[PDB]
């Protein structure tokens, strides 16, 4: 079974260095070449570079003077170094193997899961969570939409869980946006209106990065 697995720092300051290791499983680095590809938030894929099974490298035109790609064959690991980081370098970084084991790849075979790299000068900040509850002035019927507003955190991401997962029943997760240097997202859940406020509804907000879990009971008024 062929596997690729990237480990990265997560967050890095905007002039420091980035170093990502991709460990390889199920095939040897003396047989195949390895591509690094990146994707900035909401943008298309960019080819970053390649290290060939030989040991030689090629870099993307735009990034070629900041990039170095090395490799330890014995350890099954591939390294990407990147100097003088820009805010632009914020991306998910993937490694991929060539399916052609010879100097002309037919394509990129298997891919890693990718690793998020965030480049800034903001600091780990737990999120503020605020409940989103109907005004006592507009009673609907069949069903009720409730929300949680998750504001002022860093870095990405959070996960909002509703009632221990008991509700995937129309959860909508709105992608985070950047606000005053920090992220904000919101999540909504729709439930039968005979079960709220009758029965308890909670949103649980995990922010692994700061090690915080925040719960908010959703209550009328």
């Amino acid at each position: 079974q062929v596997q690729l697995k990237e480990s990265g720092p997560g967050l890095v300051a905007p002039s420091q260095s980035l170093s990502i290791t991709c460990t390889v499983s199920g095939f040897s680095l003396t047989n195949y070449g390895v591509d690094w590809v990146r994707q900035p938030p909401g943008k298309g894929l960019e080819w970053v570079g390649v290290i060939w099974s030989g040991g030689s490298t090629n870099y993307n035109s735009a990034l070629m003077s900041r990039l170095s790609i090395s490799k330890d064959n014995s350890k099954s690991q591939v390294f990407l170094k990147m100097n003088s980081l820009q805010t632009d370098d914020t991306a998910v970084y993937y490694c991929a193997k060539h399916w052609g084991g010879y100097y002309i790849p037919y394509g990129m075979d298997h891919w890693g899961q990718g690793t998020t790299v965030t480049v800034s000068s903001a600091k780990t900040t737990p999120p503020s969570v605020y409940p989103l509850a109907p005004g006592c002035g507009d009673t609907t019927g069949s069903s009720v939409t409730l929300g949680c507003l998750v504001k002022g955190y860093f870095p990405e991401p959070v996960t909002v869980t509703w009632n221990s997962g008991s509700l995937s029943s129309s959860v909508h997760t709105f992608p985070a946006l950047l606000q005053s240097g920090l992220y904000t997202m919101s999540s909504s859940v729709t439930v039968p209106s005979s079960t709220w406020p009758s029965q308890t509804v909670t949103c649980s907000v995990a922010h692994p990065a700061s090690s915080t879990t925040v719960d908010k009971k959703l209550e009328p008024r």
Binding site: W47, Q113, G135, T145, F174, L177, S188
Partner: protein
């Protein structure tokens, strides 16, 4: 320095119909060895890219024959027949022959469905936020189609543009609709000096806007 340009950017297609994606290179891609190295990748929402077609026209293992690629020297097409729900995502042409390898800009495959009006709900600021100094009024527009939609924020019947943030979901895989969230952020002091807050959603399902509001009282 070898630019691949994909069209269209976003391709609406009915479930079971045929989808057709094209890629053009700024320069002919053919190696004087007759060979031509063009591959098509698919990236499903939240997933790693995966190889569909590898030498203009070759299917990668496990890829159903309803996916086909063709093209000459600068002109290439991916064709998807009988489009299923699994087919949704962004398609990328890729060229590796010529150094450096380069992707096209991607084409989002969107599932066409019947128009659907949003369910809108406005939410006043929580008191715990008010305590903090801020006040965000929130509007959810859930489960609509198509994606274009206009949110207009009103404060005592006056339009407000400053401090609005909007966020769309990707297309739902089950019902094929979009949802979006609009947030108006004011200071507590700003917020407390007005009575009404109004969310207005204009959407092709109606010439009438859908309006939700509350009074602070």
């Amino acid at each position: 320095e070898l630019v691949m340009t994909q069209t269209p950017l976003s391709l609406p297609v009915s479930l079971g119909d045929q989808a057709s994606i094209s890629c053009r290179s700024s320069q002919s891609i053919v190696h004087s060895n007759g060979n031509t190295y063009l591959e098509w990748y698919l990236q499903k929402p939240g997933q790693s890219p995966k190889l569909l077609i590898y030498k203009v026209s070759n299917r990668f293992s496990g890829v159903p024959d309803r996916f086909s690629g063709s093209g000459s020297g600068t002109d290439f097409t991916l064709k998807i027949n009988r489009v299923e729900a699994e087919d949704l995502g962004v398609y990328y042409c890729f060229q590796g022959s010529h150094l450096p390898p380069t992707f096209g800009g991607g084409t989002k495959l969107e599932i066409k469905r019947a128009d659907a009006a949003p369910t809108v709900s406005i939410f006043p600021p929580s008191s715990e936020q008010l305590t903090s100094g801020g006040a965000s009024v929130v509007c959810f527009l859930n489960n609509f189609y198509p994606k274009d939609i206009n949110v207009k924020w009103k404060i005592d019947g006056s339009e407000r543009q400053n401090g609005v943030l909007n966020s769309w979901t990707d297309q739902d895989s089950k019902d094929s609709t979009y949802s979006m969230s609009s947030t108006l952020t004011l200071t507590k002091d700003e917020y407390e000096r007005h009575n009404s807050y109004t969310c207005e959603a204009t959407h092709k399902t109606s010439t009438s806007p859908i309006v939700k509001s509350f009074n602070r009282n």
